[PDB]
């Protein structure tokens, strides 16, 4: 799952726990994504799996094309509203939580991404970086 990423992601503040609705950033046809699990989550009692920018999650399309709904497909968190600290000392937070639809190999289902893309997400996933318009 998460081993299909290129590069090692630093620790950052998790801002999208399970059952969080985030906006679909790509033109796949989905409007929002419902997070049901996060890849690489260990065994901690009572703690919800939580996701941050660049993480891969399993998500369900609550609103969108009917064929897209009613199933589980992998997603990548691309934008986060919770603030996280880059190792250089800058605190980042996007205006909204956003994700994109990808296959387990890591290639996104969409053809373009709307809005900024987290630099950490772009570095981990080249395909998202390739389709991104601006990376910040």
């Amino acid at each position: 799952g998460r081993g299909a990423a290129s590069g090692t992601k630093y620790r950052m503040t998790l801002g999208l726990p399970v059952q969080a609705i985030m906006n679909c950033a790509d033109n796949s046809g989905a409007k929002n994504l419902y997070i049901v699990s996060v890849f690489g989550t260990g065994a901690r009692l009572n703690r919800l799996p939580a996701a941050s920018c660049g993480d891969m999650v399993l998500a369900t399309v609550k609103k969108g094309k009917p064929d897209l709904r009613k199933k589980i497909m992998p997603a990548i968190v691309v934008r986060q509203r919770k603030a996280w600290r880059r190792k250089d000392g800058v605190y980042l937070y996007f205006e909204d939580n956003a994700g994109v639809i990808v296959n387990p190999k890591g290639e996104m289902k969409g053809s373009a991404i709307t809005g900024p893309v987290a630099k950490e997400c772009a570095d981990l996933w080249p395909r998202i970086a390739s389709n991104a318009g601006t990376v910040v």
């Binding site: 090692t8 009692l45 009572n46 190792k87 250089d88």
Partner: protein, 377 residues
């Protein structure tokens, strides 16, 4: 049905207040006779802490040769005065202090350590010792010879010039520092020739050494099991309280176990945090100590308005990586690391780019008053 690891470590209890205010070096580095005579400990005062910007020179890392921001702790370390020496002889029951030799003249700062009420006392400590030191040095010579002949461990008694620090306290802190390196005869000669002289931290530590910091942590008073031990808060519906441990034991054994979380003192405890790098040993006289080479801008370590609840650091200081136990103005002990380490993180040289001296008493926005007047009309 489910499992969860224990809440907290069982190696740190009893969670009682430390019996000492100043950190006790419970272990000294193994003595190596090949190494030259040197000190293996120092005693400073936590002035405060700030943050810096540093270029990360670790190859293979995701941020190699790019700037990082790190929080650093500044400890004011004015030179310690070596006032005495004490010898230890190894016995089948452990180390035993064979004898102690003091210097001829002891300052008022260290003499106040011996009195609870120095104002009312006649200040008579070491007076007869000074008299015998002057009139007959042969008895002192026999004592030093005894240390050289029988004692296998040598520790110098040192006190800190606390009057140089901005502290209302006037009793100088005194400790024993083990002298490793060379023969026992060499240690005694080094100790005797250094009576009443001062040893600076520049001689001991070398601007990159991994040291241990020893001190008593900041006291939080009495606390409950939710805060003292990190147990889960009980549900909102609970009767008679929720910030506690629900079950404190089984039917048998018919006792509460030592391993069950309880309330009580949570803080003011003795800690020995390991592997703290010295990022910079600054000299007191130098006015450029906080100014790096990529920054220029002649400035001192003290932020604008002074260190919060400490003042202005005018003496030699040490800037350590990360946090240290204890509040500000607390006595801290820096000792040489007992373990060997060959890690790239522990061996990489440190070259700072910028040191933050904006006011920590708020949201500082200016580094120095000179450019503060520039921005302000």
């Amino acid at each position: 049905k489910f499992e969860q690891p224990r809440h907290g470590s069982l190696g740190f209890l009893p969670r009682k207040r430390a019996s000492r205010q100043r950190g006790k070096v419970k272990a000294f580095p193994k003595d190596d006779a090949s190494k030259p005579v040197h000190l293996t400990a120092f005693l400073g005062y936590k002035a405060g802490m700030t943050h810096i910007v540093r270029d990360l020179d670790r190859p293979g890392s995701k941020m190699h040769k790019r700037e990082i921001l790190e929080a650093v702790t500044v400890i004011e370390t004015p030179p310690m005065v070596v006032v005495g020496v004490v010898g230890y002889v190894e016995t089948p029951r452990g180390l035993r202090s064979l004898t102690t030799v003091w210097a001829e003249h002891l300052s008022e700062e260290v003499k106040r350590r011996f009195y609870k009420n120095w104002f009312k006392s006649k200040k008579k400590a070491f007076t007869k010792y000074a008299k015998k030191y002057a009139e007959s040095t042969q008895s002192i010579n026999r004592e030093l010879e005894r240390i050289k002949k029988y004692c296998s461990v040598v520790r110098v008694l040192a006190h800190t010039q606390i009057r140089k620090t901005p502290l209302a306290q006037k009793k100088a802190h005194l400790m024993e520092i083990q002298v490793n390196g060379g023969s026992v005869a060499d240690k005694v000669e080094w100790a005797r020739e250094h009576f009443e002289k001062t040893v600076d931290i520049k001689s001991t530590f070398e601007q990159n050494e991994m040291i241990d910091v020893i001190g008593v942590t900041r006291g939080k008073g009495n606390e409950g099991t939710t805060a003292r031990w990190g147990t889960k808060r009980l549900p909102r519906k609970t009767h008679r309280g929720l910030r506690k441990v629900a079950c404190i034991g089984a039917w048998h054994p018919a006792n509460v176990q030592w391993t069950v979380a309880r309330a009580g003192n949570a803080g003011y405890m003795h800690r020995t945090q390991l592997n703290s790098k010295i990022y910079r040993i600054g000299a007191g006289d130098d006015a450029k100590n906080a100014s790096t080479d990529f920054d220029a801008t002649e400035k001192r370590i003290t932020p604008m308005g002074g260190f919060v609840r400490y003042g202005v650091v005018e003496n030699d200081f040490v800037m350590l990586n990360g946090a240290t136990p204890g509040p500000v103005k607390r006595v801290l002990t820096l000792r040489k690391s007992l373990l060997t380490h060959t890690s790239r993180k522990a061996l990489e040289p440190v070259s700072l780019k910028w040191i933050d001296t904006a006011s920590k008493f708020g949201h500082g926005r200016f580094q120095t008053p000179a450019e503060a007047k520039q921005f302000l009309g």
